[PDB]
Design a protein around this nucleic acid. Sequence first.
RNA 1: AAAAAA
Length: 219
Amino acid sequence: GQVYRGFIAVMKENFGFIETLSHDEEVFFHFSNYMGNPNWLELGQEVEYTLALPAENVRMLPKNSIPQPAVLETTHNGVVARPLRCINPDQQEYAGLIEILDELRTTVISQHEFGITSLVNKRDLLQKGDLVSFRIDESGRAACVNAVRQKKRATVDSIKGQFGFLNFEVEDGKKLFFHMSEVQGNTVALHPGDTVEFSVVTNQRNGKSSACNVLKIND
RNA sequence: AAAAAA
């Protein structure tokens, strides 16, 4: 009967997780306890919930309902020291952590926690070692976090339903996997022999790489 | 083939 507010952090097939107001923990909810159509829930969405502990009576709130700290002016470059727990559910800390380093890159100047509402692209796989460009808020947390990834180019080699492979080699001479959900813009269909621009992400838990932010560049 | 996580 205890009522809280928070932000959608994870969405699975019939359940998800809500990031707490303080951005320091997550709460489970089953979709049968969401007061609406869960297909319309997006990551970052503001919600009100009641603890049963899992959450119940999860309710969508109007955008900008939940006050947040002011975001301070100017951007910074940082490095991710720890991911958000959503991508490593066994890690002790909930929040991710970004560090700003000194010029030798061997002393931490400042540290900034982040959560789902910190991220510009809430689907990006932000992991230890990733470079980010971001803002700091009045509470010291990271906001407006953008991943800074090197762009590569390659031809599409094959397409199998909702995924395919690029002529860009990773381990063992294997060709780089991509999922169609990463294809940017209003491209109706890629074909083998098209050229795409992309970044490479390697999942540090299972070692698998994929192409992200895939943009067709040939006419 | 389920409600705690490709």
